[PDB]
Design a protein around this ligand. Structure first.
Ligand code: LEU
Lengths: 147, 147
């Protein structure tokens, strides 16, 4: 249930998550109260999940990033791997995936040696084997597309 | 350097892109002017790159997401696939990687049949082979860590 106004809003907020209400209003042709109200509804259905500064991972110390695919050492009991890895701050994303492995993580770390220590924490806390793909360079990311 | 006032600043902004200059400055131990100018140098030094709302992709009609691993077919040609694909909009992310493939893409798409289309386009436009891994579920996605 996304009408055209909602599409302009989510599209403007994808590009600028700090658009103020007056800017959005005068872009959608609405009152500032109507915008507030539409935005609130977007947030409470789960259309807008939240708002974030896009931080440069190199500037804060994360010089190495990697994809880690993980697969349960014993796939019999149901899977708590996402829940159990939620406590590891260096895991930034966690997806379940079709094919041979069961999840892919994106992980960020200070160095090669910090990566090896983190792979150990991952194997032990979710009881998983790991396959690691170091990222060499990010050309662009999160380029969110509203059709 | 990142003066750890700067650290409490980027942590607060990573979890809330719409925190306001006022509510920051408090939990920061500063003034709505100090806080305010700092944040402008953070965007200047490329430490915060942007602000974005986090849009749920299913809610806007991206029912299938995928990692698409790509390798150029001819190594006598310049390897420019990131630039070559930058105009295709359903490629949300592009990374060069150290593993089997040269790059990894994250792609979002309407349906299994639209993915087939998109892959064929990726292949004919960069000049690549594709190997894709279907995302079943996002448990959490860019939860940025600041040490
Ligand atoms: C989500 C996973 C436990 C499923 C498995 N990797 C498959 O492709 O069938």
């Amino acid at each position: 249930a996304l009408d055209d106004i909602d599409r302009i809003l989510v599209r403007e907020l994808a590009a600028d998550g700090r658009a103020t209400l007056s800017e959005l209003a005068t872009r959608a042709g609405l009152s500032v109260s109507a915008v507030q109200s539409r935005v609130r509804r977007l947030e409470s259905r789960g259309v807008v999940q939240g708002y974030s500064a896009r931080i440069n991972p190199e500037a804060v110390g994360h010089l190495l990033s990697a994809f880690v695919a993980i697969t349960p050492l014993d796939p019999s009991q149901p899977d708590d791997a996402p829940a159990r890895l939620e406590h590891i701050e260096e895991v930034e994303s966690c997806y379940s995936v079709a094919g041979e492995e069961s999840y892919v993580l994106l992980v960020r770390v200070a160095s090669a040696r910090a990566l090896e220590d983190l792979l150990q924490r991952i194997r032990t806390t979710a009881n998983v084997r790991t396959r690691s793909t170091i990222i060499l360079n990010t050309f662009y990311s999160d380029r969110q597309h509203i059709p």
